């Protein structure tokens, strides 16, 4: 009963104590406030689905059907290092686009936050926005010391 | 550390966003401990009237301050009648990351107690119940997993079915002879290759030890069509070809300087008698013809760090994959080597680079092609992730 | 059954010993 719950925790603690595994958890689920819109909406595939397959209302199809769709959309680029670089600086422009937008995009963040901190410490820790700074698009975060953090590494609440 | 991890994070989230153009199938699972080894068992269960088939994977653990295990896990893979949402990587609503087989969760079926980390684990072709394992104590261990309990003894005690001796140091190279039952090769840090004929107490001394290398012997593989032939690669930057019929086991039949740095892995083509590949710490994959090893047929250069594993596709003579510490798994099409490509395309790599898997967040220790589901690959990485994935059919067709 | 593990908490009572770690990591990473 509680023996089982405890054994589940032993398994969880063994993954999380490993720092590479620990950072994978950040990569998989941790999206800051400004990045959530950039990733949680429709992707280009879902956009193209909606626009060039307007009578397709289901989203549960077979590999073959999915294949017929992707062959209509043409061959993708190989995920080169150049490709990720072009995608990375597109992400930098999408961020500023969201930024100067300050109408269901996130509001600018005494807001309690979860922030990425590195070096000695290396988790996501809670704290307060001590100071906002639209200059370098950063926040001062005081942790439950004070650090200047990019906005794409700060999550509200 | 911040600059490297910001690039990795964004490039990983970018990859997820793009995963619907690139995969017929992507499944992300988190192991308790990272695995250094991964291999598809050859059996598949195809239940009557289901949209999934059942596959089995040989994995192991890598942990220093807990007990280790040889692991047999189960995977449910979709077939052609399976309907799933391929339109986006799900990470919130399911039990694996990505899209594909609803039922496609990895399940631990058997954990067997092991002496330290599982450096490598391979099943015997002539009897897939028999897995050989490479230990840090330098022994090679043999298990029939059907004769061990599903739950391992918590005392942690390792009781191999056979214990193969001959090495004085640990290693990673392991290869069963696909045309002679029970003939196993092993490559070790002790500079030696060890041979056993386990169709021979529970301890077995090596039948034969080959001593040509002068540094860590990284990898060894049997030739897949010639029962006497096998290859080896070592930290002496050499590829060596050995004939078990020869009376001299201190000198190979052939010995070429293969790369400009350590050579980590090799693999023979399952369709050609003459073709093989090596991967190197020099970030290269080299192609070789046995009829003249005096220089590479071809060098595949797109990797950005040490390559630690290469495997031919079991379904396609001209398809080859390689894996490295650059966190990438590359798939090559040999038939595309001289091809013309657009200047648009050339920025992403040579025409023989078929596909780049950017799904892994750390170094990839090992991967296996599925022998029953063409183009499906299982790959494991040092951050505990095990990914089961399949490149978009769109990519390897026209 | 809620535990604290490295500045984040997770109720492991909704899971079982057979649950794979992927969905448990998610609950560990999610917030309020």
Residue numbers in the entry:
A (entry chain B): 98 to 199, 214 to 220, 223 to 257, 262 to 274
B (entry chain A): 10 to 209, 214 to 411
C (entry chain C): 95 to 126
Task: Paste lines from the article.
The MuvB TF complex regulates cell-cycle dependent gene-expression and is critical for differentiation and proliferation during development and cancer. The core MuvB complex is composed of the five proteins LIN9, LIN37, LIN52, LIN54, and RBAP48 (or RBBP4). We find that the MuvB subunits LIN9 and LIN37 function as scaffolding proteins that arrange the other subunits LIN52, LIN54 and RBAP48 for TF, DNA, and histone binding, respectively. During quiescence and in early G1, MuvB binds to the retinoblastoma protein (RB) paralogs p130 or p107 (p130/p107) and E2F4-DP. This complex, known as DREAM, represses S phase genes and late cell-cycle genes.
We call this subcomplex MuvBN, as it contains sequences toward the N-termini of LIN9 and LIN37. The LIN994–278 sequence is almost entirely visible in the electron density and contains six alpha helices and the Tudor domain. Instead, they wrap around and from extensive contacts with RBAP48, create a binding site for LIN37, and anchor the Tudor domain to the rest of the complex. The small structured LIN37 CRAW domain is bound between LIN9 α1 and α2. The LIN37 helix forms the primary interface between LIN37 and RBAP48. In the MuvBN structure, the H3 site is for the most part accessible, although the α1 and α2 helices of LIN9 pack against the edge of the propeller where the H3 site-binding peptides exit the propeller face.
